[PDB]
Design a protein around this nucleic acid. Structure first.
Lengths: 49, 44, 76
RNA sequence: GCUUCGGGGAGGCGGCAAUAUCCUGUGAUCCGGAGAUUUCUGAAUGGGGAAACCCACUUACCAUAAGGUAGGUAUCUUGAAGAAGCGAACGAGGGGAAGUGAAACAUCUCAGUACCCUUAGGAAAAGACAUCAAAUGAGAUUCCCCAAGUA
RNA sequence: CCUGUAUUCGAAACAUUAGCGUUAACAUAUUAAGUAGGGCGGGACACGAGAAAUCCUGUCUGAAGAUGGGGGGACCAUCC
RNA sequence: GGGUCAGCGACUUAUAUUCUGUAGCAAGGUUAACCGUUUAGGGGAGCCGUAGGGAAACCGAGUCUUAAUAGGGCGUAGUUGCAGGGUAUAGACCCGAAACCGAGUGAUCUAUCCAUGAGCAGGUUGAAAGUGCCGUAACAGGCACCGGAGGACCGAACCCACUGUCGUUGAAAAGCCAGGGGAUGACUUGUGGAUAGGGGUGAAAGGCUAAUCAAACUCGGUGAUAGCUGGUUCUCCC
RNA sequence: UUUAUUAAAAACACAGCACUCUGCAAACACGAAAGUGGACGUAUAGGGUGUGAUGCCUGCCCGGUGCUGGAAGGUUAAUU
RNA sequence: GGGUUCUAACUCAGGUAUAACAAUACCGAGGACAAUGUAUGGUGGGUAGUUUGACUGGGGCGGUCU
């Protein structure tokens, strides 16, 4: 899963950087608890703006 | 000799009733077969 | 029933085939699992009985797209 | 059995099955089109039930008594309109045997047949090439005769 | 001889069929990704795994996307 | 095997193929589906024959094998209709299984269970407990009274079925008579309900599950199959 | 208690004994699943098996087949 | 290349609220285990379909089958 970081978290990357995570990690923790967003054009534009 | 048959209208009506036949989908098929054959007495 | 909503997968029929080539009727059941999908557009968890391919479709297309597809399909 | 609109012109009130009272040129009986009435059970649908039964609620009106008249009150789907149930064969789809044959029998056959389930229409399905062909190429689908009991 | 046959024929009313006109219900894609293909297990193809092409999918996967892709009965190249 | 008589009763139909007879054409014969104001006429796709050899390529009155050109193997009047004999696929000359499979109907009989009611004349026997007295250091123990337990006893109703006779085309598809067992309990019985077939239930006999049980009944597959039994109808000639 | 309808018995059952399983969403059973009985019970409880009041008792054998425990070594599927 | 820990998937036939079942929300208890889908080895008369030859001074047993 390609995902944009919404905050610093260890061993993955910086704020706003796009990482690849395991689908379970991305789907069950980060996105539901508001630490990242799915990697789409409409979300990268939202974050950059 | 209590013989095989011993009539009781209440049990007969519950077991072979028109309403009991309608309740189950299969029994409606039996009733429809009686109607198709042309039998005058559909149910007891 | 044991049917995947997103993709409509349902039990398949087939044959158990022995080494002597004896055939017996068998079923192939979908990998159905209960999963609570987080939906931001409604700020809530929606529980679906979904297949693994269904979860992959959630991953690829988005819970919003799949949910609107189900609502168009009917039961919601 | 009633009303109306047409036909018809001398008998008629269905049959076993006649009798009696009667009707009929003021057009009867009879035939065709339309309309009205259409008890109760039955999808039955106000609730229930051992079908042709029991018990109701409510709106309006009437009666003054212990009621009558005309309605409304099932469930589901869609956003007030639909659906339910029944009934030949054919179509499409979801499941799907065994007797039998092989001179036994398990691969195989029977056969995707019998049967169960779902669901339409006068048909259904399919249908236009991400199809064949390798001939000078043809040009959707469906059905018939060959190819051929051949590969 | 009677009812008939050949022949010519009637409709107040209603149904049905076709043509035309009009209405209100629905539909009206814009070129196609969890798709083609692939591993495992099955099914259908006259074809019983067979050297087995082609189609469907329960499971796990998964492109190119016209400078591309499918088929032409394993498979490769050329060709159509 | 047949009581007798009368009626019904068993080699068929469709297609494919081989041989024979007959008819038309004849190195040619014939069309199928279809069109058709439809038995005519059209429709030449297709089929058989006319050439065979070899697995095949390939060759061809030849060809295969072989180094061989030797040797050897195989080779050097039909067709379309009609009729008949046979064969192949279909039920296939007729009748006849015990069986297997699918879907339904059955617990009004019977097996167990659930809920709710009812029944057990009459007469006996006398457990625990209890009371009182004696007695014990207290215990214990003894006697009398009282008490009414028991899958307790005798014995009707009720339930059952151990013996014998009768009956055996019975009064009865399981009985009658004379005796017999239990008879306050693991009892009997009324009503309603629940368990359904490779399933149920079973104090267990493979017992019962509607006079049917080592796998109920009805319909369907089904005209199951039967190298087996039975039958197979007019006449004469070789 | 039993073979309704040729067998009522030494057969079945029985109280009692023993082994074994089950820590509860128990084991076990019906069912495709849900849902049930077990049980609105809890190791003095429940299931299965054998024996069958009571008195005295219940000897030897783990080689075979089961069951319990162990993995040092050999062999071993898909998959890769 | 194995373990330990965590929770956020998943489970509860645990408590509270929701009239009751269920679901849901929170808490609590587990927890990448359990369980289920596909594939796969073992076991499996619990259940099915079947086989288990012939000659023979009847059959079986013995003997024989070229």
């Amino acid at each position: 899963m390609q995902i944009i970081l919404l905050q610093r978290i260890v061993n993955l990357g910086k704020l706003g950087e796009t990482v690849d995570v395991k689908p379970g990690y991305g789907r069950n923790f980060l996105i539901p608890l508001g630490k990242a967003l799915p990697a789409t054009a409409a979300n990268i534009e939202k974050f950059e703006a | 000799m209590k013989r095989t048959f011993q009539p009781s209208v209440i049990k007969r009506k519950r077991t072979h009733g028109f309403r009991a036949r309608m309740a189950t989908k299969k029994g409606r098929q039996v009733l429809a077969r009686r109607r198709a054959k042309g039998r005058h007495r559909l149910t007891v | 029933s044991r049917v995947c909503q997103v993709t409509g997968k349902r039990p398949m029929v087939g044959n158990n085939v022995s080494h002597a080539n004896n055939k017996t009727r068998r079923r192939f059941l979908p990998n159905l699992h209960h999963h609570r999908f987080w939906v931001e557009s409604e700020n809530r968890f929606v529980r679906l009985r979904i297949s693994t391919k269904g979860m992959r479709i959630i991953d690829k297309l988005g819970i919003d797209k799949v949910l609107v597809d189900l609502r168009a399909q009917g039961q919601k």
